[PDB]
């Protein structure tokens, strides 16, 4: 039952960096150990980075286990080795270089056309499973990666809560955070909304599930990374993604699931998260509105946000060609 | 603007007539390297080492600067911050009178012991507990009590917010979210806890600053304790913290009446009301994460440990607030 957890998990990866984090995990690790696993890190995701593809598999490894395993005893330390790792993909990303914030509505419209050109919706994996088309087993598909999408989320909401120090755009993300665990019945969490689908269509929904999809890996790696980045753009850019911009896949899902049998109360996860208010019309718009002067806020959303869609897409590709597969 | 950033690190730092500041400082800087960060660490925890030991200087700079480190806003800092900050809560924890319990008692047994526990410290009789329930405040002195208030109020759901940042399991986390939106104001924001709070000081003639910095040596001990057990590792440090504050406080309604006594409106003592609650602690819906971990002495170690040392600190707190409260009218 440590699956999950970061020492398993690092015994696990044929690799000598794997074994200078677990020294730099221990509980009477050095300075020097600490200080040895951030460089040996920092060098390896700049040796990947730069092509080096066994390098780059080998980091997206270790940032995985590093920033999303579940034993609290390491985090501090393994939140600070995943820093080293952050600070040299940032410096690769292509960064938005504005050099004057764009005015409200050109930012607005910007976002729009970029949403447009890279929603999720017009994937063709997207429209295959909304039709109705996709059999048992390539819905098992779509909804074992939608677990590991959904199930750890509030975490990193969580996250992005910490670091907004305004009292009241806190209050927006903890009313967000109270949504998605469910209210006052924890067993409506959305997390186990989806775990009761996921019973339902026959899969386990485990709390402590490992992804072994290297698309998957750099999707949660990556979107860990932004909502906690000290730089609160990056995580609004994916909070907007995410929560903010009119959902849409919910309820096409919702009513093929009900199409192919599982009940009302089963395809529930679905069903919550439908929502026709256009984004500027919530309220969590505000915690964007008030930075949009900013032009560091804007570099950081916009950034983001195209990295965000980068991984993304290239996950629904892989998810997709599992999906034609079976 | 120098208001705006009254509570960053650097700008408190810069006050702070401390070498070891300095130290900080540099440690902080967007560039700062490994060798910086890891000299900043040991000059705290030999400041700290020195202050517990006895030095009365060592003891009051090494708060200082774990007051700036751990509740500073500036977010560019905070994971460096908390980085260090452990460097000193490594040593804290060493000088602390912690429980060497052997075994895990039985359920019974570390309810009655947390009991008695909390009725051996409790503030009923406290002479400035009656002072304020008896009506005998001046409202210059009702302004002492509710400065102070302030402090331990304003940013409280961050800790709590730790707190659910440590906690793995999601219905355990569901938990503290259901606290935080609760202590945010539902709905509301404009009811949050502490904007209750802040239209009480106002109704009383103060300002509620969000930006605002201690300067009471056994508040700012407070304060650190406060944050340092909401953001253990081990999580038995905050549920203790989180249970002696929620839970169990049996306060509020004696301040909330002599509040409308002393001709304050319901509306404008909302804050003490709405914390008012009949229920047993084992009775509520939190204690449940309290009761799974039982089983376990080394959670009953830290947790006992987390309630002494948060009851210590808590007592010389409000001892300070009593003198500082018969030094005015
Ligand atoms: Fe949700
Ligand atoms: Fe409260």
């Given at each position: 039952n440590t699956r999950n957890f970061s020492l398993p998990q690092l015994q696990n990866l044929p690799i000598e960096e794997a074994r200078i984090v677990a020294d730099a995990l221990?509980?009477?690790?050095?300075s020097r150990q600490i200080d040895s696993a951030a460089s040996k890190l920092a060098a390896l995701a700049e040796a990947g980075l730069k092509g080096d593809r066994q390098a780059y598999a080998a980091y997206q490894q270790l940032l995985y286990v590093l920033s999303l395993?579940?034993?609290?005893?390491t985090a501090q330390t393994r939140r600070w080795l995943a820093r080293a790792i952050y600070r040299v993909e940032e410096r690769f990303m292509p960064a938005a270089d504005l050099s004057r914030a764009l005015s409200e509505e050109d930012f607005q419209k910007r976002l729009e056309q970029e949403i447009a050109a890279?929603?999720?919706?017009?994937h063709p994996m997207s429209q295959y499973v909304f039709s109705g088309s996709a059999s048992r087993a390539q819905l098992q598909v779509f909804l074992r990666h939608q677990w590991f999408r959904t199930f750890r989320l509030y975490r990193d909401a969580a996250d992005l809560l910490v670091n907004l120090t305004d009292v009241d755009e806190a209050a927006a993300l903890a009313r967000y955070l109270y949504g998605e665990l469910?209210?006052?019945?924890?067993?409506?969490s959305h997390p186990r909304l989806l775990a009761k689908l996921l019973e339902a269509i026959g899969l386990e929904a485990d709390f402590q599930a490992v992804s072994t999809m290297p698309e998957e890996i750099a999707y949660l790696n990556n979107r860990a990374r932004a909502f906690r980045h000290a730089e609160v753009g990056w995580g609004l850019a994916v909070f907007y993604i995410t929560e903010?911009?009119?959902?849409?896949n919910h309820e096409k899902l919702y009513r093929a699931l009900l199409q192919a049998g599982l009940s009302e109360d089963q395809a529930e996860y679905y069903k919550v998260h439908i929502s026709l208010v256009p984004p500027r019309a919530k309220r969590e718009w505000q915690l964007i509105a008030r930075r949009i002067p900013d032009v560091q806020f804007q570099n950081a959303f916009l950034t983001s946000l195209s990295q965000h869609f980068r991984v993304e897409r290239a996950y629904y590709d892989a998810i997709w060609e599992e999906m034609q597969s079976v």
């Open positions: 221990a509980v009477h690790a050095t395993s579940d034993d609290v005893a890279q929603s999720r919706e017009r469910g209210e006052e019945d924890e067993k409506g903010l911009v009119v959902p849409g």
